[PDB]
Amino acid sequence: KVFERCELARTLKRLGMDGYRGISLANWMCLAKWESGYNTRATNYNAGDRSTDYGIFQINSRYWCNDGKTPGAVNACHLSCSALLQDNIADAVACLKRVVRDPQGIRAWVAWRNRCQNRDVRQYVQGCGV
């Protein structure tokens, strides 16, 4: 499903996203916007290493989830990539929390790096009452 901006903001806040590991909700909002357009069914196949990015947060199948088709997969989230394609994003949020705990943190998300890092992201949560 495709979340409406404020609907997503409220869901993430409710799931403990606001300030997680020091990262703001607006930053998470910007990340989701540019990674998937708030679409939980979004998938991106990377011909290079044969890995795929899954869900609203576009989490990669080589290091975080298992899709059974990616070489050298690590499955750090100990979760099937299918759970990252659900309308209910609780599983995705739990894996995202694991992803960010690694050394490079939020820099793990290229779209966030390109369109959010070092920029003003206050607009993504404006008028959402979060």
Ligand X SMILES: CC(=O)N[C@@H]1[C@@H](O)[C@H](O[C@@H]2O[C@H](CO)[C@@H](O[C@@H]3O[C@H](CO)[C@@H](O)[C@H](O)[C@H]3NC(C)=O)[C@H](O)[C@H]2NC(C)=O)[C@@H](CO)O[C@H]1O
Q: What is the contact surface with ligand X in residues (CB under 6 A)?
A: 53, 59-60, 62-64, 74, 99, 102-103, 108-109
The distance of closest approach from Cβ of residue 130 to ligand X in the complex, given in angstroms and rounded to an integer, is: 23
Looking at the chain, the number of H-run helices and the number of E-run strands are: 4, 3
Nearer to ligand X, 69 or 122 (CB): 69
The distance of closest approach from Cβ of residue 127 to ligand X in the complex, given in angstroms and rounded to an integer, is: 28
User: Residue holding tokens 């869900």?
Assistant: 55
Nearer to ligand X, 74 or 122 (CB): 74
The tokens of 30 are what?
A: 């910007």
Q: Which of 4, 18, 35, 67 is catalytic?
A: 35
Please indicate whether residue 35 is annotated as part of the active site: yes
Nearer to ligand X, 36 or 60 (CB): 60
* Residue-by-residue DSSP string for 31-59: HHHHHHSSBTT-EEEETTTTEEEETTTTE
Nearer to ligand X, 8 or 108 (CB): 108
The distance of closest approach from Cβ of residue 109 to ligand X in the complex, given in angstroms and rounded to an integer, is: 5
Report how far residue 5's alpha carbon sits from residue 106's, in angstroms, rounded to the nearest whole number. 20
Q: Which of 4, 53, 87, 91 is catalytic?
A: 53
Residues 6+ apart with CB under 8 A from 3: 11, 32, 38, 39, 40, 56
The tokens of 41 are what?
A: 């069914």
Please indicate whether residue 91 is annotated as part of the active site: no
Q: Could you list the active site residues?
A: 35, 53
